[PDB]
Amino acid sequence: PRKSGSVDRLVRLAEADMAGVNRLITDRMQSDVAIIPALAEHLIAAGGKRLRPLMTVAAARLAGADNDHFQKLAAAVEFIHTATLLHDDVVDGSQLRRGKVAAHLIWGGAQSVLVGDFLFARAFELMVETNSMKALEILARASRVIAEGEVLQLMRSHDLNLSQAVYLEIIQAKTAELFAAASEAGAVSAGVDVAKSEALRDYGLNLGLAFQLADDALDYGGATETLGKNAGDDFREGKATLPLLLAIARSGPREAEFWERAIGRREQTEADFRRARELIIGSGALDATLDLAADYADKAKAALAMFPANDWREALEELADFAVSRRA
Amino acid sequence: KSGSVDRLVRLAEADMAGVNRLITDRMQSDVAIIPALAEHLIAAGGKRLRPLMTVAAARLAGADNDHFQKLAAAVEFIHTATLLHDDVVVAAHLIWGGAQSVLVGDFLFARAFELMVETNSMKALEILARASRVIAEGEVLQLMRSHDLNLSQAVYLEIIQAKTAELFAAASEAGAVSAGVDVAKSEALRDYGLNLGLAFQLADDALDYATLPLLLAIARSGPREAEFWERAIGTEADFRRARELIIGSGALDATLDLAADYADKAKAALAMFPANDWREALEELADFAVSR
Numbered sequence: 001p002r003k004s005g006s007v008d009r010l011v012r013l014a015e016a017d018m019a020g021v022n023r024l025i026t027d028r029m030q031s032d033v034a035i036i037p038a039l040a041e042h043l044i045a046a047g048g049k050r051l052r053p054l055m056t057v058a059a060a061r062l063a064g065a066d067n068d069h070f071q072k073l074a075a076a077v078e079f080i081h082t083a084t085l086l087h088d089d090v091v092d093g094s095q096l097r098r099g100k101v102a103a104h105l106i107w108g109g110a111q112s113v114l115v116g117d118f119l120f121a122r123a124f125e126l127m128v129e130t131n132s133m134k135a136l137e138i139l140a141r142a143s144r145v146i147a148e149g150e151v152l153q154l155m156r157s158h159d160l161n162l163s164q165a166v167y168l169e170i171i172q173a174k175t176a177e178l179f180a181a182a183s184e185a186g187a188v189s190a191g192v193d194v195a196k197s198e199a200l201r202d203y204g205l206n207l208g209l210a211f212q213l214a215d216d217a218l219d220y221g222g223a224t225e226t227l228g229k230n231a232g233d234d235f236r237e238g239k240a241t242l243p244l245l246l247a248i249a250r251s252g253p254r255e256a257e258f259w260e261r262a263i264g265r266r267e268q269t270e271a272d273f274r275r276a277r278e279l280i281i282g283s284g285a286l287d288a289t290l291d292l293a294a295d296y297a298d299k300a301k302a303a304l305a306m307f308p309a310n311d312w313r314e315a316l317e318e319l320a321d322f323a324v325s326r327r328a
Numbered sequence: 329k330s331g332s333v334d335r336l337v338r339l340a341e342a343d344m345a346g347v348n349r350l351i352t353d354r355m356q357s358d359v360a361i362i363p364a365l366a367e368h369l370i371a372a373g374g375k376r377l378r379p380l381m382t383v384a385a386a387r388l389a390g391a392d393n394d395h396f397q398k399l400a401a402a403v404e405f406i407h408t409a410t411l412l413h414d415d416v417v418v419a420a421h422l423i424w425g426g427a428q429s430v431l432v433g434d435f436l437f438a439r440a441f442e443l444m445v446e447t448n449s450m451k452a453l454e455i456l457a458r459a460s461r462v463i464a465e466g467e468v469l470q471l472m473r474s475h476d477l478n479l480s481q482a483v484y485l486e487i488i489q490a491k492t493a494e495l496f497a498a499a500s501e502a503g504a505v506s507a508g509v510d511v512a513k514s515e516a517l518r519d520y521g522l523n524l525g526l527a528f529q530l531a532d533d534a535l536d537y538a539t540l541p542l543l544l545a546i547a548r549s550g551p552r553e554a555e556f557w558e559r560a561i562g563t564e565a566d567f568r569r570a571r572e573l574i575i576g577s578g579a580l581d582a583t584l585d586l587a588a589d590y591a592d593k594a595k596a597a598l599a600m601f602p603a604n605d606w607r608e609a610l611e612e613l614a615d616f617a618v619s620r
């Protein structure tokens with residue numbers, strides 16, 4: 001049995017920096033156009049684990065930063081994340097996010113998209129203030145790669161003959177890259193050698209793969225009330241993810257017409273989800289997904305080998321295990 | 329006094345070829361539908377006014393370097409991204425093709441900033457990041473006032489300044505700063521772009537006869553019984569009734585003249601620059617914004 005980890009040590013070590021990050025967040029979500037801070041705070045104040053800014057903070061302190069200018073980057077990262085949520089929820093048609101109704105059901109799809117565009121621009125304004133051209137290139141690139149991954153998913157995730165390799169390419173782009181960017185931007189703020197920033201980048205990329213694999217498994221195996229979003233969104237969208245792909249592969253010839261109807265032609269009821277959830281758990285497909293996630297978590301922990309075994313390093317190792325073990 | 333758009337287009341030929349090559353190259357992805365969907369909007373737009381601003385401003389400010397071409401291309405990406413996020417349509421779910429438009433928009437927005445990073449110009453990035461922010465505020469404001477019967481002239485101007493003119497101003501200002509000129513020079517060129525943007529929009533509002541002409545007519549056709557009465561009707565049979573209220577109250581004429589005032593302001597902003605082909609082409613453009 002693998003270690004649980006936790007976020008607790010990370011959160012506690014980063015407390016003094018996150019108060020600065022949260023101050024920037026509340027500040028930059030402000031606008032004279034009143035819908036903007038209303039829509040934004042509905043999402044931001046609703047909750048969220050803040051893992052991405054936490055990783056920027058952790059990476060900066062592990063790399064030994066001498067000022068706190070990384071806090072603006074951490075704030076920018078959360079805005080980028082927040083914006084991608086607004087856009088992704090509109091695209092996927094999801095009804096719940098962080099325990100609240102998805103913003104686009106209250107303010108409309110257009111306003112959700114536009115407020116996302118606001119946050120994206122606010123994120124770059126913040127980065128400009130830090131004067132770190134390298135950190136700005138890192139997050140500009142990450143943001144482009146997210147969009148590419150989302151398009152790739154839109155084009156290719158909606159048929160059952162999706163390969164594992166294309167799936168891993170999608171999750172690397174749409175999810176793991178922002179984690180890699182968050183750590184790498186944190187590291188470059190500190191003004192370090194490329195070996196350290198590359199190591200931290202490596203940590204975040206692998207953490208994000210583990211993270212997304214666990215998220216995909218949680219979509220079938222989690223409870224809506226702990227997740228803050230509807231279990232079964234992927235299935236009801238007709239979106240193939242690894243747990244589904246692996247389950248199809250163990251299922252034999254007898255289930256092929258069920259998937260074809262529910263996913264390929266996308267004809268569904270609520271009963272189809274309960275049937276799918278059972279076939280994903282029972283076939284061990286959920287477990288195999290998490291085995292792969294744990295493999296990526298090991299890679300994330302090994303990526304930090306060059307760093308001193310201090311509290312920041314231990315916090316990041318515990319986060320790697322947490323990425324796989326978490327329920328939300 | 330007519331002017332042209334054609335004079336600047338011809339002057340900016342050698343520069344715009346390099347801009348269009350950057351535009352084509354940077355829109356590419358290993359994800360095939362991204363450049364396919366982007367080229368549909370880009371190549372079938374024709375005019376390229378916003379990147380022209382950047383080319384023209386950098387040339388008038390006497391740029392020795394090449395950097396403005398990447399900023400010009402980035403400006404077109406931002407412009408295209410904003411167009412992609414407009415057609416999206418409480419309207420909860422996306423129209424067909426809406427999903428790709430959101431995400432290709434996100435791609436181009438991000439590509440623009442990558443392109444700008446390549447110039448190493450932190451001032452240019454600052455200008456365009458702020459522009460992007462203001463545009464997004466302008467677009468949110470327009471949508472929360474899309475219904476509005478009683479929208480004042482001032483607030484409408486604030487909307488179009490943010491959602492249309494700001495990009496023209498930012499394109500010009502960014503072009504100027506890539507030339508390495510002083511603040512007075514970049515400020516003037518910024519002002520040219522801003523006023524030009526306003527002049528284009530207001531004449532476009534006039535060339536269509538919830539814009540300024542209708543807003544003025546309703547404000548000049550008395551209180552709530554041709555205000556809320558027109559707003560309740562706000563079809564094709566119902567059209568020429570409000571047009572009569574537009575012309576007859578002198579609202580269409582008030583729009584055209586305001587448009588011209590903005591064009592003159594644009595021209596007056598260029599007065600510190602040498603009276604050369606670039607300046608005269610920009611002067612002619614300001615007149616074109618009104619005549620066309």
Ligand code: DMA
Nearest residue numbers: 047048049050051098175215
């Ligand atoms: C890509 C992905 C799974 C996004 C949701 O992120 P998260 O689980 O970190 O969300 P939150 O910020 O709400 O904790």
Ligand code: DMA
Nearest residue numbers: 084085088094174175215229
């Ligand atoms: C915002 C983003 C990059 C989402 C991708 O992952 P997902 O659709 O699995 O996330 P969620 O389940 O949080 O909607």
Ligand SMILES: [Ca+2]
Nearest residue numbers: 088089092094
């Ligand atoms: Ca989603």
Ligand SMILES: [Ca+2]
Nearest residue numbers: 215216219234
């Ligand atoms: Ca998910």
